[PDB]
Amino acid sequence: MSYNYVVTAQKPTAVNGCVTGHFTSAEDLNLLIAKNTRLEIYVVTAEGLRPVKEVGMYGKIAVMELFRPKGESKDLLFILTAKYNACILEYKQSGESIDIITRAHGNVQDRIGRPSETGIIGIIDPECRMIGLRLYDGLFKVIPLDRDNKELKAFNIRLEELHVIDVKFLYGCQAPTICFVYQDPQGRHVKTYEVSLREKEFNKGPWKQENVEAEASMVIAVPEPFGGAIIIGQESITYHNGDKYLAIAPPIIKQSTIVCHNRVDPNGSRYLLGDMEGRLFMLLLEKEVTLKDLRVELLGETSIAECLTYLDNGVVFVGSRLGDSQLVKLNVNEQGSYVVAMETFTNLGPIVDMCVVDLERQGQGQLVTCSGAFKEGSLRIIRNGIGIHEHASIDLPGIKGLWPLRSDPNRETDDTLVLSFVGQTRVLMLNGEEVEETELMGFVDDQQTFFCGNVAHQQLIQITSASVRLVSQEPKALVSEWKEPQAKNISVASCNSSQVVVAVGRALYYLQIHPQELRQISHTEMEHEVACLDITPLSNGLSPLCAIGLWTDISARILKLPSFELLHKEMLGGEIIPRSILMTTFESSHYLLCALGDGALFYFGLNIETGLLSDRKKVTLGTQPTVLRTFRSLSTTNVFACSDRPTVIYSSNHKLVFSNVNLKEVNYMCPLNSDGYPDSLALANNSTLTIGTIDEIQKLHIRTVPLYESPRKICYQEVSQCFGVLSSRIEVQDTSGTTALRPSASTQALSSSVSSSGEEVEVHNLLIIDQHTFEVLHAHQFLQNEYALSLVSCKLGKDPNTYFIVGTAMVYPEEAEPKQGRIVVFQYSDGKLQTVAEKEVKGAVYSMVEFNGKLLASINSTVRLYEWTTEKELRTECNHYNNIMALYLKTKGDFILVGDLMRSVLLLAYKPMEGNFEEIARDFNPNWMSAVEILDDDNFLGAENAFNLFVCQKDSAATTDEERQHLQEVGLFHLGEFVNVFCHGSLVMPTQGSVLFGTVNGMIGLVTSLSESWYNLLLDMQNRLNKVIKSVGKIEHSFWRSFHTERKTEPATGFIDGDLIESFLDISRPKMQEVVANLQYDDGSGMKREATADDLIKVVEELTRIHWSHPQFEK
């Protein structure tokens, strides 16, 4: 609506910068990584990297450089943000307390200035006299590094050369000297200048070189003793100094564009170079002291590197924007100099498209992204839950139950897993990680076990259909056996350390565990068949209550012991009988859970002495019946719920919560505290027994499905249990006439189809990827020069089939505007993709949306609506000619939101009685727009330049027809990220609505709506938090969030920053009361009483529950 809450669900993963130095101490070697708005600080260790501190800034890090001014014990850090906020930071640590303090700060933006084409360049001279900033054409800003320059005051030196490509400060010079590559009418050249510190002007530099390579783009300052500079172009690498000139152009770099570099050693005898394709090179300066020649060696392949940094021990950090980041080892006499991958780091960006699987389910929905580009392209399956580290797998099918057990009374650790099967029981012994099937004396393999385990007096119990068997630990024999008076088989079995409550049809029986004897104490008949029983002591191993579920009554009731007196009777409702029942305590407060035959779970409070339901609550846990099992996590007790959707039930603020398990269908479970598997669990499905350890806490589980090509669009087709993915791959023209660069998803599919029988070419495909295995089941190749643009998965008209529909465009280098394209309707039946129908359009099909059982498509500047007929053809119903290109298309009801690349918003309405569209409203505001979404019938969200969000609303006032057709700008916010996709979807099961967004940096965020009362409270809260929260670099949050373009800056409105709001939980108790001091809390009556810290702790806590939680950085 008009009031929105925007919060981060996954911080940016893409790496834009990486530096090494000595930040945390003079003795430590650090690795500083910039991930947009975040700075991660690691300590390089012989084994690997150790995370020490991660900070967020109210800015997009544009420059990050470590430096050591004279008199300083360890390095300082210079950061410059995209909004020209400059700062010098220092790492301060007192024991286990870490702060990043601002030594100096200030905004270095100029009132006038044309921002340079090769962007912001920030360089520091070797002597640390100054910071040199190339922000605008014709100017070189200089910030002296004097101790007293705490406001980073600077001066500009006019540069005659207007088009500078790259600049660096040289080494071994008599005064701060810059070296740069520039272009002018006579070509590309290299020039140097001295910075006169007294004059604050440029002086004639030591050397220059006119007419360098047309493509030279990188300046490398070589340190002493040689000094000078290295220039890297497209086909050549050259060295320059006052007198010397070296030039190489080796074939090894002929087909590479080098875009990054790093100095390996302090003498600068070796450099690492990375091209746009993942090749890693080593540039060596060969001495004879003097510098004699240059040599390039191809080391191997890494991820496409944005930045490289040599660490130590031949370990290189590869910072990537298009694929996962890495730690590679350079190995690098016998072999050539080569590289081996050591560690990989998840990078979800760029997220070019995404979709939600299980959106309808309350929570438990996975997000699938089209991530990366080129050889780094992949799908990323993102789900939140508790993971299980599997340690062992046993192929043993048909398991109907698992029980932990201790065959040795002198040991406290379990050493036996007993499993039941239909009409059978097997015993497995554990000797460390060695599982070996054995026989247990006194236990029968003849019958199916309903319960078994350790009981009182150093004994074991085994409850089968035939009988109840007491077994001695030392002698391993059946000391006592209880059987039904008429030999009738048991139907339900419950037991604890000293009590056994067996159910024989409708009649319950209460046996008591005694030394070498099972004493039958009580025998009663219930008014319905017994479906589930429980006697968990909540006591000295004795529970005076018994939970029992019934068939005819369909109720879960709590009875007294040993009197069988009904203390309460609660009717569950419906026609399915219960499956499991459990009495358990969460955070000293008792409960009574009840699982139904249709995966429905009921949870009520249970009075230990009274025996009655406190609150009738229900939570659907799946389709399959649920089996509840108690287990201990730490001091407290948790319950594992086995079904098609396994769940862990726990307490939080004395209230039940339901974290889902990052696992598939689990039928049975039991805790296992073996010597080889301590504090572990056993899980059983239809065919396997798994022994694993459940993770500490809920985190994101990301499955990477590499495609080795670029995924462009994704749709989910539930009926087919698969994904439709538009993808492209680059091929190079071959002599024997085009060919692939490497195998990828579209060339490695199980089955494939085609649309017809040295420069690059894009081959477009439709992949059908299985949703469980992720194998490429099929690949369809589009026509030569045909660009696949849009994709939907839907049912049309009266047709029951679900189709994959693709909108294409014919792309010819000679034609600027697309004049040809088509809509192809595909069906994935059995194992193949069939083309059902095709529709030629006279333009590009930029977008497609299923619209009320019809296909709404935007072709060029028009919006067309198609009907799917019984002859299985798309027949044109109506058209809407827009004065804009219909790039974006979103619909809600009969409304259509149409948008172009320049932020032109058009609102249309399908008139069913007229058979055409009517323009409702519009808004022209030229700015680059990257995505749009409909929030509700009246409000529209969009992402516009530069990294902003905006909300426009159709007018409430309705004064006149002109006011009715004009959209009002009600929200603006500088997000700091570039949104590629918006989609409605549930993350976790006040606020209304959920809109997720995917970005270029791999960040995933959420936009939800607020009431005016909530927005006004949180807006006040932000202004009070902005006075409490310390900002790295002393940047005002309001300046950071202000809507921004190079030309304009307006304050944010209509948006609440959830990342700032949630930081309230991390501030001190006294500071919390300063924040909430004059806040007006509204409980739901208008009576705005004063807000307390506890009111806002509960308010901000439920806000954290609407999105995925962020992981702690440091160990």
The residues that touch other proteins, with contacts defined as CB under 8 A, are 16-17, 115, 117-119, 163, 165-166, 183, 185, 187-188, 214-215, 217-218, 257, 259-260, 276, 305-307, 321-322, 350, 352-353, 373-374, 710, 787, 789, 811, 813-814, 816-818, 861, 883-885, 887, 901-902, 904, 924, 926-928, 930-931, 945-947, 978, 980-981, 1000, 1046-1047
**Distances in whole angstroms, Cα of residue 804 to Cα of each of 707, 712, 720, 776:** 20, 15, 11, 16
Lookup: tokens for 705: 């499905």
In whole angstroms, the minimum distance from the beta carbon of 1051 to other proteins comes to 16
Nearer to other proteins, 353 or 534 (CB): 353
| Residues 905 and 899 sit within 8 Å (Cβ to Cβ) | yes
Nearer to other proteins, 204 or 1047 (CB): 1047
In whole angstroms, the minimum distance from the beta carbon of 1072 to other proteins comes to 38
Site of tokens 């807006």: 1019
In whole angstroms, the minimum distance from the beta carbon of 1061 to other proteins comes to 27
CA distance 325 to 348: 10
CA distance 782 to 90: 56
Nearer to other proteins, 162 or 479 (CB): 162
In whole angstroms, the minimum distance from the beta carbon of 80 to other proteins comes to 13
In whole angstroms, the minimum distance from the beta carbon of 19 to other proteins comes to 13
Nearer to other proteins, 460 or 931 (CB): 931
Nearer to other proteins, 5 or 846 (CB): 846
CA distance 207 to 191: 7
Nearer to other proteins, 216 or 1035 (CB): 216
| Residues 976 and 947 sit within 8 Å (Cβ to Cβ) | yes
**Is the CA virtual torsion 386, 387, 391, 396 positive or negative?**
positive
DSSP string, 591-635: EEEEEETTSEEEEEEB-TTT--BS--EEEE--SSPPEEEEEEETT
Nearer to other proteins, 349 or 385 (CB): 349
DSSP string, 192-217: EEEEETTTTEEEEEEEEESS--TT--
Nearer to other proteins, 149 or 927 (CB): 927
Cα(first)–Cα(last) distance of the chain, in Å?
Answer: 41
The SS3 assignment for 946 reads coil
In whole angstroms, the minimum distance from the beta carbon of 582 to other proteins comes to 50
Nearer to other proteins, 260 or 934 (CB): 260
In whole angstroms, the minimum distance from the beta carbon of 357 to other proteins comes to 21
In whole angstroms, the minimum distance from the beta carbon of 962 to other proteins comes to 10
**Distances in whole angstroms, Cα of residue 246 to Cα of each of 190, 294, 295, 327, 679:** 14, 7, 11, 32, 65
719 φ/ψ angles, rounded to the nearest 5 degrees: -60, -25
CA distance 428 to 417: 5
Lookup: tokens for 87: 């700062």
The torsion of the CA quartet 786, 789, 791, 796, rounded to 10 degrees, works out to -80
The SS3 assignment for 57 reads coil
Q: Quick one: which H or E segment has residue 1074? A: helix 1069-1075
Nearer to other proteins, 349 or 1058 (CB): 349
CA distance 793 to 161: 54
SS3 content of the chain, % helix, strand, coil (to 5): 5, 55, 40
Lookup: tokens for 754: 């085609």
Lookup: tokens for 286: 């060969």
In whole angstroms, the minimum distance from the beta carbon of 629 to other proteins comes to 47
CA distance 48 to 1023: 41
The one-character DSSP state at 629 is E
In whole angstroms, the minimum distance from the beta carbon of 371 to other proteins comes to 11
CA distance 63 to 122: 6
In whole angstroms, the minimum distance from the beta carbon of 1001 to other proteins comes to 10
Nearer to other proteins, 589 or 733 (CB): 733
**Whose CA is closest to 251, among 193, 194, 313, 295?**
295
List strands edge to edge, sheet with 821-829: 786-794, 803-810, 821-829, 832-841
Nearer to other proteins, 306 or 553 (CB): 306
Lookup: tokens for 324: 């996962």
1074 φ/ψ angles, rounded to the nearest 5 degrees: -70, -45
Written as one letter, the residue type at 918 is E
Neighbours of 541 (CB within 10 A): 12
The SS3 assignment for 1098 reads helix
Nearer to other proteins, 277 or 799 (CB): 277
Nearer to other proteins, 811 or 1028 (CB): 811
**Whose CA is closest to 125, among 18, 27, 223?**
223
Nearer to other proteins, 681 or 791 (CB): 791
Residues in the chain: 1115
Neighbours of 394 (CB within 10 A): 17
Buried b / exposed e over 735-757, threshold 16 CB at 10 Å, is: eeeeebeeebbbbebeebbebee
Neighbours of 156 (CB within 10 A): 16
In whole angstroms, the minimum distance from the beta carbon of 196 to other proteins comes to 28
CA distance 507 to 828: 55
